[PDB]
Amino acid sequence: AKFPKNFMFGYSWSGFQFEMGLPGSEVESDWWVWVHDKENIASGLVSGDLPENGPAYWHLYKQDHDIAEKLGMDCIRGGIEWARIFPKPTFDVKVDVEKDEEGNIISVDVPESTIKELEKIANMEALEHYRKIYSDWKERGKTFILNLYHWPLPLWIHDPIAVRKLGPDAAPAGWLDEKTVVEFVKFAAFVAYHLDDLVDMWSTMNEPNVVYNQGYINLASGFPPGFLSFEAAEKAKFNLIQAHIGAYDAIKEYSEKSVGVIYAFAWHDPLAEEYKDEVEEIRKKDYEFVTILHSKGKLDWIGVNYYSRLVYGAKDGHLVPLPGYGFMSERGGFAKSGRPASDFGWEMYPEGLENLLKYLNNAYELPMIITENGMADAADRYRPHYLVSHLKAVYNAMKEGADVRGYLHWSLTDNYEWAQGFRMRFGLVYVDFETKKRYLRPSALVFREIATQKEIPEELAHLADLKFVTRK
Amino acid sequence: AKFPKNFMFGYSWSGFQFEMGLPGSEVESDWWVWVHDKENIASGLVSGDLPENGPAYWHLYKQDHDIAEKLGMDCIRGGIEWARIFPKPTFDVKVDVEKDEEGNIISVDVPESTIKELEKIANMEALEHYRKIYSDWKERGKTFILNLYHWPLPLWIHDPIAVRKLGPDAAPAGWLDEKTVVEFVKFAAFVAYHLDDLVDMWSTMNEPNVVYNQGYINLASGFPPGFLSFEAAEKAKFNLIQAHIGAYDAIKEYSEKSVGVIYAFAWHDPLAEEYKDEVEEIRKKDYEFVTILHSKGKLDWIGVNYYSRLVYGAKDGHLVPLPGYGFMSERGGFAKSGRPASDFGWEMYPEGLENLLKYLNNAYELPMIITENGMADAADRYRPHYLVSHLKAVYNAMKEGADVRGYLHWSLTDNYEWAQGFRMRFGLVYVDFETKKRYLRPSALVFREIATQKEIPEELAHLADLKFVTRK
C-alpha cells in the first residue's frame, strides 16, 4: 500500500497539553484555573494532575523535532495560545468586523496601523518564542500547519469558575459573549500578519464541537465552564462558527495560504438495519458545523480528527449511543465487538476512518488531512496495530477517491490529557514527566518504516489485521 | 547498556518445529506418530495441529536467513534430525563404546571405515540438504551452532504408542534402552565427520530434562511416551547423561570445536524467607543434570534456555510450585505478582535470568550463551518488553562477572509448539501457516536496533521497565 510521493507524515500538538513542564512556561487561562480548582479536583471532575508538570515542549522543542525528523516526519500541525500572545485585554483596540442582520460576519479589516497598536499590548516575547519553535521545524525543510485555537481562552475572556457559580451574565463568559469573536478576529489577524512566513496552511480552530458540547451539555467531561444549558451550547456553537469565518477573513487579509478547520469526527453506526436512517440523520447533525462552513465557501481544507465510533440502538423508547461500543467501551478492556479498547475505553475501529473519509469526500469534495488519530496506550500493547490499521483505512479511502494530503498522529509524545491528566498516554514516544526524558515506543519504529518508505510495506501489512488483538 | 563487540545476537530453531510445511519435507519419528495419534488428539492431550502444516523452513530457509541477517543477527543455533539422517536402523554397524562398571562411557571410537558403512544406510540426500541450509547462513560470514538432538527419535528407536500400551520391554523404548545411547554416538560421529566444516560450536542435546520429566512423570504435558514411572524418568535421565558424554567423545574424534549442552533452566524462588533453604536444594536438584556433565569435564559451554520461574510454598504439609506464579500463571492474564503472563501462562520475570546467570557463573565458571529466551505472544503486545527486559538482565549479570557470549531468541518465526500446536506463537516474525508468508512484528524492529548497535540504546531503555505492563 503505497502513498503518493508528497503525502505528508507527521504529528499534532497543542499549547496547553505540551508547552508547560519547566520553569518560565506557565501561562494563565480558563483551562489553567479550571484544572487547578480545588473543588474540581476534590470532586474528581478533573484529575489533579497539573499541566506545568508536562512535557516542557516550550523548552525542549528542538529535541522533539529531532525525534520527529528521524521518524521520517515531514509535517507538524501545532498551536499558538491566545492566552500567551494577549495576556491583557484587547477590547479598546477597535477594528472593523461587519455583520449581517442574522449575525454573520461578512467582512473584517484589521489595518496595519491597528496591528501596531496590538503589538504594544501583546506579549511580543511569547510571539518571538513561538517563531523560534516553528522556525526550528521549518528550517529543516518541513511543512508546518498552524492552528489558531485549541481550547484555552485568556482569563479576561473567560472566567469559568465565576460563570459556573454566578451565570454567564455575571462574568467573562468565553464563547457565550459576542465580543469574544471580535477579539479572536484581532488575534487571527495579528498572528497572520506576523507569522505567515513560517506557516504553510492554517486552521482556525480545533474540535470546536468538543468545546461547546462538553462545556455546556456533557458535564461529566469536566470541561469549562461546566454548567448545563442547551441554549448556551447553541450560542457558543453559533459564535464559534462566526469565529471561524472572522478568522478566515482575518488570515486572508495577511495570507494567501489555505485556511481550514480541524474537527472531531466520530463515526456513527446503527446496531441494526432498523436504525440506519436515524443514524444517517445523526451524522448530518453531528457534522453540521463543518457543513455550514463549507456551504459558506469558508473552508479550503478539512482536518479530520478521528479516534473511534458510536453505535446506536433503542433504550427505553429512545435511540441512544450504546455502552460497550466505540467511545463508550470499557477502559483497558474490549468492546462488545471483541475489538480491544484503549486506556480511555475507545474501541479500535479503523473501518470508521475508511467510512468517514469516503463520506466526507462525497459531502464536501475538499482536500483533507488526518490531523489527529491515535490511542491511549501506556505500554504500546496496541498502538502498532492501531497505527497501521488506520493508515490502511486512509489508503483504502484514497483508492475510492478521497483527497487526503497527509496523516498526523496524536501524538509524537505523551502529554497532558485535559481533565484526565497524564494517565492517558497517546505518544509514539513515552515521556517521564519527572525527568522530561523521551523514550521511543515500538510504534515509533513502525511509524518510521512507513513514513520513510511512503508505504505500508508488505512485511508490516499484518499490523493492519486485527485478528490477533480481537476476542473470539 | 553496551554489549561486547563480539557478543552474538541471533535465534534458535529445531527440526520438528520448523522444517515441515511444504511437500517433500515430511519425516516419521516418535513425535510425528504421537501428534498424529487419534487417541491423543481426541483426548486433548495434543492439539490436533500437525507439523507438516508448519513454517516450511526446509524449503524457505534462504528467505528466513535473509530476514535474520537484516535484523542484525550473526548467530543461529539450529538442529539436525536423527530421524532424517538414519531412517533405517544402524544397530548392525558396530562401533567401540567403552563403559565402566557403573555404566559411564569412558571412550568412543567410530573409525573412518565405519563412517563409510554408515553412509551406505544414511539418507545422504537429507545430509546434503542440511548442508545447503547451514551453508546458506555460513556463506554470509555468520556463526552457526549445531545441536544434535531436539526431541524426536527415529521410530526404530522409539515407538511410543506401543510403549504406552504394552510397556517399554515390549517395543523400541527410546532413552529407556541402553543401545539408543550407542546408536546416538554413531549418529554424533557421523554428523561431526561430515559437517564440522559448517559448524562453529556444538551442542549434544536440547532440554534433556524436559524429555525425561515430561515423558515419564508430568503426563499432562502430552509428551511421548506418556506413561508414569519415576524409575523410567531416572533411567532416561541416566541414559541421556551418557548420550551427552558419548556424543561429546564422538564429536571430539572429528572436531576441535567446543561441545556443550542446551538445558531448560527455570529460576526457583521461595514465596517467603522460611522456604529459602528448601528452594536452594530444589535448584541444586533441578540443575544436577548439568552439574554432573561439568563435574565429569564434559562441558565446554552451557546453552541457557530461560523463559520463567517457579515460586514455592507449603500446601498440605508439602512444599510445591504455586499456581499464579511463573510457569503456572493464567494464560493471557497476570501472575499474582501483577506481572503479565504470556499466551502459555508464563510470567514475565527477567529478574530470574539475571539471578540464574549469576548462579550458573558461580556454579560452573563456563562460557554461556542464552540459547532460548522468548514468549508466546500472538499479537506482539508484550514481546518488546520481554525482549529488552531480559536483554538488560543479561547485561546486568555480565557486569557482575557472568561470561555470556550471545543471546539467541526463541524464535525468529512462529513455529509448531509441540503438544500445543500453532496456538503458541513465539516469533519476532509472524507466519501465516496457510500461505507461509512471513510478516515482521514490532519486536523484530526493536531487536534490529539493539543487535545492529550492540547495545540497548537509551531511547529503547524504557522497554526494560515493566511498570506499564504490571498490574497495580
Numbering used by the authors:
A (entry chain Q), B (entry chain P): 1 to 472
Paper text:
β-Glucosidase from Pyrococcus furiosus (BGLPf) is a hyperthermophilic tetrameric enzyme which can degrade cellooligosaccharides to glucose under hyperthermophilic conditions and thus holds promise for the saccharification of lignocellulosic biomass at high temperature. Hyperthermophilic archaeal BGL (BGLPf; family 1) has also been isolated from P. furiosus and holds significant potential for the complete saccharification of cellulose at high temperature when combined with EGPh. BGLPf exhibits high hydrolytic activity towards cellooligosaccharides at high temperatures. The thermostability of BGLPf is affected by its oligomeric structure.
Therefore, in order to disrupt these intersubunit interactions, we constructed a BGLPf mutant (R170A/R220A/Y227F) in which Arg170, Arg220 and Tyr227 were substituted by Ala, Ala and Phe, respectively. This three-point mutation of BGLPf is referred to as BGLPf-M3. Crystal structural analysis showed that the BGLPf-M3 crystals belonged to space group C2, which is different from that of BGLPf-WT. Diffraction data were improved to 1.70 Å resolution and the structure was refined. The four monomers of BGLPf-M3 in the asymmetric unit were named subunits P, Q, R and S. The root-mean-square (r.m.s.) deviations of the Cα-atom positions (1–471) among subunits P, Q, R and S are less than 0.27 Å. Furthermore, the r.m.s. deviations of the Cα-atom positions (1–471) of subunits P, Q, R and S of BGLPf-M3 compared with subunit A of BGLPf-WT are between 0.27 and 0.31 Å. These results indicate that the overall structure of the monomer is not influenced by the mutations. Molecules of glycerol, which was used as a cryoprotectant, were observed in the putative active site of each of the four monomers of BGLPf-M3 and were also observed in the BGLPf-WT crystal structure. The electron-density map of BGLPf-M3 revealed cis-type peptide bonds at two sites in each subunit: between Pro224 and Pro225 and between Trp410 and Ser411. The crystal structure of BGLPf-M3 exhibits higher resolution than that of BGLPf-WT and also shows several noteworthy interactions between sub­units R and S. the PQ and RS dimers are distinct from each other, even though the PQ dimer of BGLPf-M3 is similar to the AC dimer of BGLPf-WT. Two types of alternative dimers (PQ and RS) are formed in BGLPf-M3, with residues Arg381, Tyr382, Arg448, Glu449 and Glu459 controlling dimer formation.
